[PDB]
Structure formats: structure tokens, C-alpha cells
Amino acid sequence: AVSLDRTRAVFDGSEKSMTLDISNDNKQLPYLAQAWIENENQEKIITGPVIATPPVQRLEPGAKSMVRLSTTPDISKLPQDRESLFYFNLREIPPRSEKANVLQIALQTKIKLFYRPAAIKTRPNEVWQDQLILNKVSGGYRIENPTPYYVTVIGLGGSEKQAEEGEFETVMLSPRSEQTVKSANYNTPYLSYINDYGGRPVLSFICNGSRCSVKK
Amino acid sequence: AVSLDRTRAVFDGSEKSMTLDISNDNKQLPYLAQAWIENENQEKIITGPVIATPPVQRLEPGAKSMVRLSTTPDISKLPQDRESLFYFNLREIPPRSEKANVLQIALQTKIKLFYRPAAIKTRPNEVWQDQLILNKVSGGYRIENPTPYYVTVIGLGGSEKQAEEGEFETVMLSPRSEQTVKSANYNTPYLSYINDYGGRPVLSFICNGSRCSVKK
Amino acid sequence: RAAFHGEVVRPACTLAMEDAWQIIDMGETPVRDLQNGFSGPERKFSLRLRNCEFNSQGGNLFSDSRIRVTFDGVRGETPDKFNLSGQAKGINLQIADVRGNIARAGKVMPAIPLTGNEEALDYTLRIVRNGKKLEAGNYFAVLGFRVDYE
Amino acid sequence: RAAFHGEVVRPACTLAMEDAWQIIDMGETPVRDLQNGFSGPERKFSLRLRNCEFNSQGGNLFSDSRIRVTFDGVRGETPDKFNLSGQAKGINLQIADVRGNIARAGKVMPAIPLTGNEEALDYTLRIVRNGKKLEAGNYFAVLGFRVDYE
Numbered sequence A, B: 001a002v003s004l005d006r007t008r009a010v011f012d013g014s015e016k017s018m019t020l021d022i023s024n025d026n027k028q029l030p031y032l033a034q035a036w037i038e039n040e041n042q043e044k045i046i047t048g049p050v051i052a053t054p055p056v057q058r059l060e061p062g063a064k065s066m067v068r069l070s071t072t073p074d075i076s077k078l079p080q081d082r083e084s085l086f087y088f089n090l091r092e093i094p095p096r097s098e099k100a101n102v103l104q105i106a107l108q109t110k111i112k113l114f115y116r117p118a119a120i121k122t123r124p125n126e127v128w129q130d131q132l133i134l135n136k137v138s139g140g141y142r143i144e145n146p147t148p149y150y151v152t153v154i155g156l157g158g159s160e161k162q163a164e165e166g167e168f169e170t171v172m173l174s175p176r177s178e179q180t181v182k183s184a185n186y187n188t189p190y191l192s193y194i195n196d197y198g199g200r201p202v203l204s205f206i207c208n209g210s211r212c213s214v215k216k
Numbered sequence C, D: 001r002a003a004f005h006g007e008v009v010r011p012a013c014t015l016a017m018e019d020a021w022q023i024i025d026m027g028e029t030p031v032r033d034l035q036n037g038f039s040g041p042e043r044k045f046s047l048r049l050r051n052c053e054f055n056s057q058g059g060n061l062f063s064d065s066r067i068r069v070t071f072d073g074v075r076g077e078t079p080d081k082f083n084l085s086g087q088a089k090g091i092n093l094q095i096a097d098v099r100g101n102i103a104r105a106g107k108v109m110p111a112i113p114l115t116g117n118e119e120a121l122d123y124t125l126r127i128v129r130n131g132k133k134l135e136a137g138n139y140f141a142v143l144g145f146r147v148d149y150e
């Protein structure tokens, strides 16, 4: 019943807080909504450096509200030249029915929360994902992410259609890192990723030996 | 040579400052760029409540830079339940040529700068312009703007195409105000306005006697 | 449409079910079926995920692994069972997707292609034994359906 | 194209001219033409406004009054003339749009339909008398072309 307005959140480190719109889409009953944050290892945190308010709130049927994300002083301890990963959680508490022998479902929404320090703030629609490099190796590719942002790769094939629809085990590369993915070899590999807006652009790559980089 | 990234600026009163990207599009010569703010009556202000930095800066050929807008403490004195109008100015100073008998052109860009207090902050793509009301009178219409925002009307005709292309003397309504516009009578008037993004949406109106309101 | 406009993002999915309480009626404790060595009757329940453009040209968020779903609850007798609350004793819950994959508490469900091109996730539950003495009585269970977004 | 993306706004126009110095050569002081009671020869100069999608389906920012242009400078002898700098004496500047409308310092130019569907604003200037004794010599003038956005 309770839903969130986005599939990922980017916290602009140049501001003190931001808000996320939530909504009880059930127009008959009231639902409660709890929110909390988790660190990069999906472990719950309560005292900072990022807090969510309110932790719990009642939503009347069809009601709209929001959850505010704010930082504590300790936020400054995070790296300022790369993103830091957190997770935002919105779990509903359905109205208690006293029906016998029933099962009740409570939705929990968990999205990535990227803390993006001011030094690497981006302009709307900026594209850094085109800096990825694919290195052919046994079994597939070793993808390199030299950028200061997390990059979520959702597709990799021999064509655009294949990158968007081909079966691929989603993987997320931390800033300045590299990971290996099992994959068939592709003459001109195409790669798809998820951007800040929940969109899925496709990138065209060109190879030279075992090293592939984005079409200039 | 020097250009600005937008045709209007909205200063979110919930933040302390914002930046505007500028650019020397001349790839051969260096141009200087001065920036300043003006109040609602287009009179220059220098000490606040809104300041532009830097006031002057040198731009190498093809160089990109920006101007930062920030508020002073006096900003709090402005109304918090409606927008306040300012103007942002970007005037270039072309490189001095010492050619005889010449005329040199220096572009000056002047855009509206809407200070939007936190209490009336808006969500992306929010539409309040559909709250306008048209009242038929001698010569044309008396347009009412009951919203807390400035509304710039650029079109008014008997059809969508007429609202977008018809000849119309652009007018801007201050928050909570009304103005009269000379116009022919239209069975189902259509009105066009300019939004925060420089876009020009069209609104469909329905009349009842002399009072017309947006199609429900 | 408009060439110039504000930020537009994909919202997260909102979960909907036939019942406004997001409840699945399990029926009286199937003692007869249980004692005979079987499991209680199956109860279907569909979870519709809306407002998130769940379906795309050639797939959907779930099948393509763009979202990962997990049923959260208390493990029962075996990893393939969920514990139940209430007076009743001797019974556990079991959940399976449209291909027979049995859900394990806190363990992600395998991505699989959907059928019917419906914008919904269909599951089936049934009551099973937990290795304890059967004791009829009302039972209850609140399960968390967690959607992790990539 | 993309259904989900960041804010995209119409940028302001960037002014471009044939000369990298954004200069118009006026030629030697036309004493002959002046003394004869005429005005110096005409010099055309086009101002191209780019990057702002100047042209639309059935119009353009200028003709539709979406932007207003004004030539800023020092008033000369009459409101229809601009003062000139330099050694020369006895001369003023005059600017006119494609229909003969003479620009007045700090006064907005009238909106009019454009010809050629070109994404440019074309003006014509010429030297005129200012009611003072003619004194040949180099002259100069920096004029501001102000674009106010609605």
C-alpha cells in the first residue's frame, strides 16, 4: 500500500537534507510507514551520519506524506572525492485484521542511497558511465570503473537490443574499482546501466585486442 | 560570445546559494563577463539581499565557467508566502580592437530571477498556472493570478495553435494579482505560458458567462 | 512531449492485492490432509506491482533482475518453511513461485520469466507439518515482501 | 527519447557575428556624402542568436515577443541617433532594422516578422550629421545589444 517516489536516491552533499515523497495508495485503509537507513553492508544505523525522519508515521487512506533525510556532523568523515553507499528503507505496517487463519503481506522497499559529496557534484544528465573499460578474460570481462561514482551494470551483449533485453546478472561497481563478469565474447559489445533517474541508457563499445572502450 | 545556460532562474529559498553556468562560445578570442542583480523595478543592487559572484571574470576562448548567486541575512525580510522578483544580468566586454572607424557589439543577457521561499517550494513539473481565471470585459480579458508565483502569459486564442502562434503582447502577472489584456473574444480560450524550464505549455479554458476557468 | 521540463524519475513499485488488508485467507487448519501425510490445500495470491513501469519492451523488472524480491519471516522446521503465530501448534507455512521454487526466509527468490504478460507476481502457499503434535486452533502470520532495487 | 532523466531547460541565446571581435567596419568618414547633405554608405551586420532554439514551428523568440532587444549607448543629437567616440567630430550613428525602424538608445526595438527564415537579426547602420562642424578623424563606438527574456 505504501510506496516511494523513486528507485534510488542521490544525496547532494552540498545541502543539509532532502525529502522523499511517500504515499498510501490504498484508498480504504490506513497504513503505517517506517523508514530507516542502512550502511554499505546493509546493516542498520540510527545515530548517523545520515538520518531519516520520521522513523514511523501513520498514513490515512490515500494520504500523501514524505520522509526527510538529513546528515549529522560525522558526515564530514566520509570521503569527499567519491560516493559513499547507503540504503533507504520504507516498510509498511498494514492495519491489523483480527481474521482467523490468515497471512498478511507487508511490503518493504529498499533502494540505494548515494551520498555524493560537493566536490563531485554533477549537472543534470551528466554521463560518467562512458568511462568504463572492458577487458576480455577467461569466461567474460573485467570491467573497470575509474570514476568516483557507483555504476550499476544491467546489460552486456553484442547489440543494443541484447544489452537491453539479454539475460545479465546485474552488478554494481564501487567507485575506482573493477570486477569480473562471466560473459560470452562480443565483437562490438554494448553495455546498459541505470542512471540517477532510473533510466537505462545503452553505451556502444569498440575493442582493440582485449581492451574495449566507449565509442568516441 | 558569452552565453548563459537558461532563460530564467528560480532561487530555491531553502538553500543558501546556486550556480549558473556561463560560457565563452567564441573559440578565438577572450571575452570578459560581468554579472549583477537588479530588483523588481530593474534597478541595480549590490549589497543584497541577493549577490552575484564574481562581478567580473575573464573567459579564455572556448572557456566555461559560472556565476554563483547567494543571499545575505536580509533575504529573510522578503515575503515567505509568495515569490519576489529580481533580474540576473550577464554582460560581456569584448576584447578591445584598435581598428579605426568601427562599431563593436557587446551582448547583454537579462533574465528573470524568481526568489521562491521554502514555504512555497515546488516539485519538478508542478503546475499552478492552471489556476488562472479569465474574465471577459470591454476590449478583452481581466486575467486573475491567485497563486503565489509570477505567471508569464505569452499566448491567448481560440485554439491551441492560436495560443502558441497567435500574436500576443506578452504579460507577466505578479503573485496574487490581476491584469487586463486587450483581446478578441474566444468561445473556448486557450492560454499559453512559460514555465520554470523555458517551456511553453498550453492550457484549455471553458467559459460560463464572462468567467472562464481551466478545463477540469 | 515537452522538450524542456523538470526531472522525471522512475518511481518505486506500489504493491496491491485483491484484499484491502493485503491478507490471504488460509482456511481452517487442514488436520485431515495433514494427518494423512499431505499438506493443506493451496491458496493463490497475486501481488501486483504498479506505478513503476514494471513491464518493458522485452521484459520486466523482476525477470531481468532489476528488482530482487525476498519473503521475510521466521524460519520454521526446515529452511523451506516459515513459522506461524497463534494458538495452533504443529504447523508451518510454505510459499512457492509459479515454477515450484520454494521460498526460504530472507533468501532472495530466483529471477524467472513471467507468464500471461500480466504485471503481477503470483505465489502459492500451503500449510505443512513442522514435526510437532497437531493442535487445532487459529493461527496467524505477517510476512515481509521485500523488493530491493538495483 | 528517454522517459526518465534530469531537468532540461532552454538556454539563453549566444550572440555570434562574422567577425571574431564582434565588430562592424564603418569605413573612412564619408565627408563627401555628409557635406552633400546625405548620410554615409550603409553597412549591414547580422547578429545570429544560437543555442536557444530561436526558431519554432510558426515563429521565433524575437517576432513573438518572447525576447526583447534593445541597443544601449549614448543618445546623439536626436533620439534617433547614437553618439560616437574618437577624434572625429560632427558625426553620429544611426541603426535601423529590416523595415526601417530606427533604433533609439535604450528603447526596445519593435517586434516584427523575420524574412528568409534565417535564425538571425539583421541591422543596418550609417554615419549621419550631429549638427556640429565636420572634423575628419578616426571614430569608435561600443554598443550594447540587450536581450531581455520573458
Ligand SMILES: [Co+2]
Pocket: C001, C002, C003, C005, D001, D002, D003, D005
Ligand atoms: Co523529457
